């Protein structure tokens, strides 16, 4: 049953879907975003334009701003990803920091970068972090 | 009126940008570094300019020949076998500096930037009738530099106690009556020649502008701020403005910018460039012909000639790219000093020199 | 008889030695890498040789023109717009390979060294009357390579098993071929990898058919010190009078007639000094290679390193642990290097006490 999986593969108000994507019907999307492989989007989430989503899962009530990038990440609930901000990781399922994890209602400000780190819930980030565990 | 510019070598400390083009041919804020002081020498009506280089000029003859007609200035080279300190290269070029009228000539360093008020310096020379003139700028760290205790008197290098804060700025103004006091042995103008005229009390200005010693590739982003800042004062209509422009941005007429971008602050895009949509430039400098693809985020970096930044690629933290470097899409670089003619298909997640 | 040599690109993975001279122009054991198999093609009487390069030959025309008269061989270049897989460059040079006699031509790779027994391979070709011939060498690790499953009775291959988790064989390709003109038609206009698409096409037809020497894939500058051992070892067998000897010599050393050595030195094992070099007194060379024109000053101790052209090692300087120097690198006296990959035209006045890339 792939019809349960989003298979847009175009731009007829549907974004560029690159296989193995589950999109909830309650999401808000922009056709300029490229939703890459292995991404599972939840309900009531606002997806920005020209954003790249591969190898990640996004929870409910997340706000993705202008030109954001998410690689090997897990975005928590009610989280806010600022514009031109990047949240990536290596993808090593054996390393502890191989998959960057964001807590509940974490606000990554504009241009702020998070590379392979773990952020707790209800946290604001004005500065870029790297290879750490932010409480 | 004549002039001489001390260049030095090829720019070993400026690699990989000086691996192909020499130090003075590197485009700084759209224009090559050599044109920043040649046009300033035309403001005082200098016809001939000599270069005290150490390498062979055979690689830049096409560049120096194309600037002689555009700027209406005579440009000739002088090549020395060995570096003769700091005042040696001037002893060789004394034949091209004496026109017979006995007028003072300028000596400039290629590793220094400023506002260059050369016009109001001749009046500072033709008023008291001095023999030699240098320029001086205030610095917060006088111990790390050579302090000038001012008419000047003595040279106190690395003063443990405070004797002054004023240091040399690398720009000089010398009468023809000084080209005889030099010896044939390599002599440093800062350690031997200047004290010879200071004890003679036959010399005598404060620099009302910015000063920056460019000796490393990372100083280009912080030195471009001091340049673009002075441009906001001198001529504010030379810096582009708009709804997608923030701060001071110097765009070329040949460069084309896509829609949905955000450029600034302190970004200089060379000619022949094509910037795509969704980009975010800040504190960086873009050289000629390089294409940056869509949705890229570049901050505080240096882009070489005819390179290529893929889509959704993030570049930050003093990442240095050579000529013709192709960054794949979705690639992240955190301070990767990359060699020219290299295809980047993996993330440089930490500072690393790639070949 | 004709021949074709696959070069590839400029040698990006061999920098900083290939920043100026291209990959085949790097001096390996005194001689450039290209001369090791061109003279071997003269052992079988090959008149014309074509190079399947990808860059512009304008930088090496002067070098190839001086080898046509010294070796009495016709050398022409072929430049492709794109690398066309592995068999593509052969489709472009088919016009320079067909002389009319329909004789088999050789196809060689620049990234491989061996003993090259080309003479006794034609007899291995003119005996059973096969159409295509390849060479095969045994490896201890067949999983990291592409295994060729042949029968141990005649020499016919059957299938290609890359990365076999279980044991299906240990014999892999060596990068040297022998093809009749009747194969230049089976290729398409599309970039095809000869190892993945073309070779299986002839194996299923059963119309095709071991290397008794050393094999080395030189794809990194550190392979020059370990590949030179295999070369000098084969020289101890082929012609042992070509390797210099003496009271200050240990192991296998290949010195040039132009190179000069001071007194009280100790060189070896596995050291190759190019021509025009100037070795001073009291030096200790071991497992290293010296290229042209570089002078090593007195009391220097160099172990397992690579010296570029026209460099200069100061007195009492210690160089070890795969230290790579570019062209015209001036190391001051008493300087220590522990794996410093230095760019050409650089003066080293500080110790490289740990592996570090200097520009």
Swiss-Prot record, chain B:
Essential protein during embryogenesis. Catalyzes a reaction of the Smirnoff-Wheeler pathway, the major route to ascorbate biosynthesis in plants. Plays an essential role in plant growth and development and cell-wall architecture. Provides GDP-mannose, used for cell wall carbohydrate biosynthesis, protein N-glycosylation, as well as for the biosynthesis of the antioxidant ascorbate. One of its GO terms (molecular function) is mannose-1-phosphate guanylyltransferase (GTP) activity. One of its GO terms (biological process) is GDP-mannose biosynthetic process. The N-terminus (1-40) is necessary for interaction with CNS5B. This is Mannose-1-phosphate guanylyltransferase 1. One of its GO terms (cellular component) is nucleus. The gene is CYT1. Interacts in vitro with CSN5A and CSN5B, but in planta only with CSN5B, which targets CYT1 for degradation in the dark by the 26S proteasome. Forms homodimers in the unliganded structure. The product-bound structure is composed of six dimers that form a dodecameric assembly. It catalyses: alpha-D-mannose 1-phosphate + GTP + H(+) = GDP-alpha-D-mannose + diphosphate. Disruption phenotype: Embryo defective arrested at the cotyledon stage. Deficient in N-glycosylation, altered in cytokinesis and cell wall architecture during embryogenesis. Mutants vtc1 and hsn1 with reduced enzyme activity show reduced root length and leaf cell size, reduced accumulation of ascorbate, increased sensitivity to ozone, UV-B and oxidative stresses, increased levels of abscisic acid (ABA), salicylic acid (SA) and resistance to virulent pathogens and root growth inhibition in the presence of NH(4)(+). It comes from the Eukaryota. Pathway: Nucleotide-sugar biosynthesis; GDP-alpha-D-mannose biosynthesis; GDP-alpha-D-mannose from alpha-D-mannose 1-phosphate (GTP route): step 1/1. Belongs to the transferase hexapeptide repeat family. It is found in: Cytoplasm; Nucleus.
Swiss-Prot record, chain C:
It holds the Pfam family GMPPB_C. It is an enzyme of class 2 (transferase). Keywords: Cytoplasm, GTP-binding, Nucleotide-binding, Nucleotidyltransferase, Nucleus, Transferase. Its EC number is 2.7.7.13. One of its GO terms (biological process) is response to ammonium ion. Disruption phenotype: Embryo defective arrested at the cotyledon stage. Deficient in N-glycosylation, altered in cytokinesis and cell wall architecture during embryogenesis. Mutants vtc1 and hsn1 with reduced enzyme activity show reduced root length and leaf cell size, reduced accumulation of ascorbate, increased sensitivity to ozone, UV-B and oxidative stresses, increased levels of abscisic acid (ABA), salicylic acid (SA) and resistance to virulent pathogens and root growth inhibition in the presence of NH(4)(+). It comes from the Eukaryota. The keyword GTP-binding applies. Signal peptide: none annotated. It catalyses: alpha-D-mannose 1-phosphate + GTP + H(+) = GDP-alpha-D-mannose + diphosphate. Pathway: Nucleotide-sugar biosynthesis; GDP-alpha-D-mannose biosynthesis; GDP-alpha-D-mannose from alpha-D-mannose 1-phosphate (GTP route): step 1/1. The keyword Transferase applies. GDP-alpha-D-mannose binds at residues 6-7, 85, 109, 111, 146, 173. Diphosphate binds at residues 9, 11-13, 23. Essential protein during embryogenesis. Catalyzes a reaction of the Smirnoff-Wheeler pathway, the major route to ascorbate biosynthesis in plants. Plays an essential role in plant growth and development and cell-wall architecture. Provides GDP-mannose, used for cell wall carbohydrate biosynthesis, protein N-glycosylation, as well as for the biosynthesis of the antioxidant ascorbate. This is Mannose-1-phosphate guanylyltransferase 1. The gene is CYT1.
